[PDB]
């Protein structure tokens, strides 16, 4: 196919040289991220079962999840939950296949629980949380589905939407991403079971100076007094330092739980390891983009990838693809300092035929856009030709969407 | 004396970028219905707290789920089969000292009043269920006053961030003003078949623009396909008029591109919103505070809708950044483009940000030196008056989506 | 057909001669009665629309409705509701017919609202209540349904259950019944708009002495202070007095809102006219029997008639039928002092073929069971043959089920 | 210490000499019984923990439980649950005690799920059920509670409440009760794990002939084809015949799962062993009275005992009390053929001082009422003196309420 790809130079200062860079990440126990990961765990568990029974992922979109805050009162040595966290699953999934029922609600509720067990280790999943499903019923005749799939080997776009992604990551980006990932590793979680999964990380660079703030819920059953807690914070400090030192020679101030105040009793302790116990809410699409970050020095799509199907929904598929394409361009094409990729769907045309795939590149010093633009074009075109590979990448947990 | 830093922005302006992408979700789109309900509830609660106690009490209603119903649209008039379900959450104050405040009554009325105006053909009594899980809260009023008196200007406890720009490009204005006119009272009186679920996408490449409009058509206003086709024409003509007032670039306009007549497929609905079957919605998934979704620009992830207008730093800074950029673009001769970013200083009042970066591309022939001073000044005046935002919000004088 | 009717004498003292008789009625704004009423409104609205669309009532049972109490703060001149009443509709109904979707939830929610407007006049239906439906889905194919109607003209029984009814009503029962229906008549609500619909009426007769206690919610917006509130109770009192005098010669004490304690500022005032605003809950089947009363001197079925379908559910149909058989016997057969009727279904046989229809009679003095048994028998047999007349009686609002 | 207890002769034919008798029981895994059981489980759990923490039972009522049928696809060898059972807990309880907090929802959720794990053994509580809580809030001052308690050690009635019990049980009553109870016993479940807990038993006696019908959900993972199924029904038949033969010499037909139609492939087959799995619904107070039975030949209260406050809810206390008193008089006083006990509260007064406690005795042949009066009066007066023992019986699981 001749595809609508456009490669242009982007004239601005590269982000490493911009004076003020702000990067955020919401970790895996943060209420918005809990919603994202449930939304996605439901889509994937549904998708796997549809493939198991019928060979093919049937239509669904479970990109709507509300995390409604409970009430709890932590205390050194072990506080308690008073009102449970209430989670609602919605979106839509095929449940009537010909005349038979597919167990959408059973699958969805089990995936949600299974995902939470691993996202918030200290949450009692039977007594601190209620999870209900209001996932909409769709219907399909299976012969119609296969016929439509024979007619269009690359699925048709259902919506007019764009995805966006860029590469490579900056030092501040890499520090932020890796700091939350390290702190929420299974590995680290076995060394310090006081560290809850609700970790927000913020990285603010002014010039060559970086402030890295970590806000991390401590679990009160694992810390019997302010001193145990203070030792926990220090271990978070030392964690972060070795990530910071692996990533920059810039001088860096690290802060943990800045709101604390020993005098007035104030410490960031929680019964469960998420602030969703205390009345903070979450919902899908309010947090990390598909590269795992929130990055106002860069660009983004407002489409929420989590929970959307990986077969036809470009709000997931073109966010993923834009990141993959930007990444291969930054890595494979000498001369690229930065690259931003933006893809807009053409409703009723195949998802590999977008209205545009806009690639915008800042050359390294010395390089002309003219030598960059052919190899950038080819990478983008080849990924577009192979767009249906994102289905399996999703089924096999090979890419993240938040 | 504030950390405002006005410097030049050394970049090709957006108009000279080759590809520009801009989207707006109109008022009856399910994500915007969610955003709108959220902010409606916030504003309702706010006017009632002030009326009763002289002060806005803490709330945040930035959590609204729109779960799609079922419907069978039909030329001549269809029916709703299962009602739309909408959940209100977040939290607010219902105990003030020894008195009680009817949080849930205010929210249900504000939500249902907001939908009545947002989706004109939705039957509120029968096509919708609104459920509240708005969380509880308790306040001692005197203590609240004594914090307000201690700090007239609220203290940050955070590094929160806001970003805004001006002026709008051609393509931005076309997209914004196309949806607004299609959902205007004037237009609805002439063509009441045009529903409020209108999503508009603008793509520019060089000097060619493609504008696509997906507008839910109301099935009781359209007796058959020729009636429907005439409505699409009138959308097309209305957009063409707005396009021509904004640009000389050749522009193609496409309306309801998913339509497939020979298969019987038309964008008709019973109520005028896809929430009735085809779509779910939720808060902070659509338009930013300037009403647009703009991947060529820098955007914040903050969901402004429903956030506390008195102390939510992110809401207030996102609004402020937009107001400051606008005024600079409008007031200062020689501004081609301006971005404002504002970053709070934890502990310090919100009118003393860590930094307020104003970055300007001069129009040709102008130098940054003749722009610096008046820009600094405009930015300082607004920061000084940061508590003004709270009363713009109450008075319905600024939008958050 | 030959049916399993057994008529026998009941040897005991008639209720009018028993020493201690207790009767109770929950009026229409009482939370348990709001549940029954809503259950039955939903079933009737569904039934009416199945008939309109298809000729025939399709299967449903909406005999599950929870009224979950709100919170409110009444005060003279007008209080406020803080948390709304929350009402869940449950049960099941056919929603797919020939792959086509019938608007179960639209009909149910509207019927609930419509019933509540009427049942609690001062309740704000959009801001003081939330109504949600979890009514379960069923499916049918219409040819299948007509072929089965064809084949079984009297529908088959799906359960093994009994109904129970009796006649005639004692003085005490008539007073209790008529006292609540008068105080909740439209006529009287025009005359005294302060009187809420949550009226509980109890009649306790000891020998030839009756204590009639009324508990009636007063609506706080039509009563400006305690003296307006005392006038209203005196109007209630005087109403009851006329009903009492119309029905008995026994001396009778009448008490209205006995928990009132003016000295401590306690008065039964409400914002809406139902106690469901203040946290009293209701559910279906917890109150009045089909004859409108709770009568421990008599006998009853534990089946809840309200919301159950009137085509095949004997848990409704045998409670209605028993009342009707018992009433016609007591009225038409001279010499019947009392008659009690109990009917037990035979699962998978026609509803007019019960396992037993037991009739128990107390003769008037001088009359022998021997001359009562044949006409009692015939009345029962006739009504069993005419059992399907209960459908139209329900559709046309000719009988009450609470 | 002088109470208004009145012993008199009941001049009536005893129930064994009536021609028709009808007795039903809903067993443990039936949806109405699930609801009653969960209600009372949550109350007792709440109570034990209030006692633990504060040395007294704080106010609650959890007599409101809605069991909304799921979807299932039963099959010989092992079927599938398609959509979870949804259970709504309502009522109210105290979560604020002075400046402290009490975890009402965590105790209720755990007690409910624990109750179910016992009640329906093949139900998977993590995947086949959702338990939602709308239990209402409440606040107390603990010295306020103790002062009230110290002042009125026997709690004061606030209205006229009523309870009725009778004894002894008839042959048919004991057959119905013991049949369900043996079929749901540990012992029998061990030997025949194919027998689910959803068992409803109906006994009909006409004269000296009894028909006993047992409807028992059979679990499909335990039964590979219809001959294994039939063998299970045979085992049910035979365990019932044993119960029957030890209780009566009257000839008795036993019927098991009468709805079955092998020619058409219809068997009472389930995945979990309760009909709640497939759209059949349940709620509180729609089933057995506190003696475990539904007895239309008898006088019954409409009170829903399950989940009511065991310190101050008087209808609950008086229906328990009634039954225990009638029982003791039956068992201890030579000459009692049949005995009814009714207790009516005295509005102003402590509940051990009722308006009346009516004890009505049919003497066995040859015995005179006046040899029965005194021992009956003593037993009744002794229990009314010991009204607080019921509280402790409830908390120690030594009485049932359905």
Author numbering:
A (entry chain A), C (entry chain D), D (entry chain C): 4 to 405
B (entry chain B): 5 to 405
Publication text:
Methionine adenosyltranferases (S-adenosylmethionine synthase, MetK, EC 2.5.1.6, MAT) catalyse the synthesis of S-adenosylmethionine (SAM) from adenosine triphosphate (ATP) and methionine. MAT is abundant in all three domains of life, and the cofactor SAM is essential for a variety of different enzymatic reactions. As described for other archaeal methionine adenosyltransferases the enzyme is a dimer in solution and shows high temperature stability.
TkMAT appears as a dimer in solution, but was found in the crystal packing as a tetramer, which is quite similar to those reported for the MATs from E. coli or R. norvegicus. Until now the flexible loop was thought to be disordered in the open conformation, however all four monomers in the asymmetric unit of the TkMAT crystal showed the same ordered helix in the open structure. The higher intrinsic stability of the thermophilic enzyme could explain why this region is well defined in the structure of TkMAT.
